[PDB]
């Protein structure tokens, strides 16, 4: 396939990663687009190009304290090696005494999360438009022996052409076999992750099932105020669907959200084809979606290069870089 030429490229970059492609002094810090346990995301302006970028700052100590050393190395390694239309573009990477930095092309449209909450729910054509993007991205990632493990609306960004750009590769990993890490977001955890079993990419296909439901319904298939209660529902093998959900949708989802991962779509003999060739995906031109030739249902409101209206506000804090190197040995390859 085109997928074989794609693995050839990924492998080149994976085996010889790019490092130290920039310095902080080259970027003009504008605004905080998001926050997290071991850093923040900032709107930066690269002075030499005049280009706008999203910069992920990771505190090395905060990464170490949270047993995230390996995960971070997996994130950058995979991000600098990949090339797909629906993935975030990592232009530069660097580190200093204090932090780790990943500079990616700015997606001013924001998270799908914001729009899904504001709008309430997407019509199945609108939901199907995005699902197809994830179905192709997973096919791409999975072919390269990569397990994403972080699918949710909060990680899907909308570009000005109205298409997806998948972020947060913090849990992405290159596994040819089984993996055992207890990671993800409660609502999206597959039953094998909760039940601490050795799992595969079938977890990425279950996550999709949850996403398609939440996009189409306006709420996830399993929610409760406390994770323990969320998990009890996921492992129960019971799903209820709204009255507006189509028969093709309900069937796709019942196959996708299959607790018996030996009967779950995308994890059978035909793999990704059982999804791409489903009744719900009959109106999907898999080649037209990849080429971005399909008309996007909604294009975000664009207020200029550097607009942050689709991102929430966070207290604009201090970027501090200590005079002493921290956790050098641990982040050596970065």
């Amino acid at each position: 396939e085109f997928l074989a030429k794609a693995k050839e490229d990924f492998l080149k970059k994976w085996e010889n990663p790019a490092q130290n492609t920039a310095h902080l002094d080259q970027f003009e810090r504008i605004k905080t687009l998001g926050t997290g346990s071991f850093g923040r995301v900032m709107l930066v302006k690269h002075m030499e190009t005049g280009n706008h970028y999203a910069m992920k700052i990771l505190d090395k100590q905060k990464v170490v304290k949270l047993k995230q050393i390996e995960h971070t190395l997996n994130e950058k390694r995979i991000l600098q090696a990949v090339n797909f239309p629906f993935l975030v573009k990592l232009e530069f990477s660097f580190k200093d005494n204090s932090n780790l930095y990943m500079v990616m092309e700015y997606v001013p449209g924001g998270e799908m999360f914001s729009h899904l909450r504001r709008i309430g729910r997407f019509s199945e054509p609108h939901a199907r438009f995005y699902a197809a993007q994830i179905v192709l991205t997973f096919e791409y990632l999975h072919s390269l022996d990569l397990i994403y493990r972080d699918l949710k609306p909060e990680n899907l960004l909308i570009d000005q052409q109205g298409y997806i750009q998948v972020t947060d590769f913090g849990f992405a990993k290159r596994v040819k076999g089984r993996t055992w890490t207890l990671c993800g977001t409660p609502e999206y955890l597959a039953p094998e992750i909760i039940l601490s079993k050795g799992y595969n990419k079938a977890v990425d296909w279950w996550a999709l099932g949850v996403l398609i439901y939440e996009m189409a319904a306006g709420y996830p298939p399993f929610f409760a105020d406390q994770p323990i209660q969320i998990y009890e529902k996921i492992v129960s093998g019971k799903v209820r669907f709204p009255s507006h959900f189509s028969s093709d949708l309900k069937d796709l989802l019942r196959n996708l959200l299959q607790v018996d991962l030996t009967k779950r779509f995308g994890n059978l003999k035909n793999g990704v084809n059982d999804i791409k060739n489903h009744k719900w995906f009959a109106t999907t031109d898999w080649i037209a979606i990849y080429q971005r030739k399909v008309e996007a249902p909604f294009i975000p409101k664009f207020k200029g290069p550097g607009d942050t209206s689709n991102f929430d506000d966070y207290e604009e804090e201090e970027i501090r870089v200590s005079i002493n190197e921290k956790c050098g040995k641990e982040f050596s390859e970065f």
């Binding site: 997290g36 346990s37 998270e111 999360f113 909450r117 309430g120 972080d150 949710k152 909060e154 913090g170 849990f171 207890l182 990671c183 993800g184 977001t185 409660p186 609502e187 955890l189 319904a217 306006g218 709420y219 996830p220 929610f223 409760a224 105020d225 994770p227 209820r240 709204p242």
Partner: peptide
């Protein structure tokens, strides 16, 4: 309704990883 029950829950915001 389930949409009402979701909207009234503390799980409507951005959900962080475990």
């Amino acid at each position: 309704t389930t949409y009402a029950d979701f909207i009234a829950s503390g799980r409507t915001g951005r959900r962080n990883a475990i």
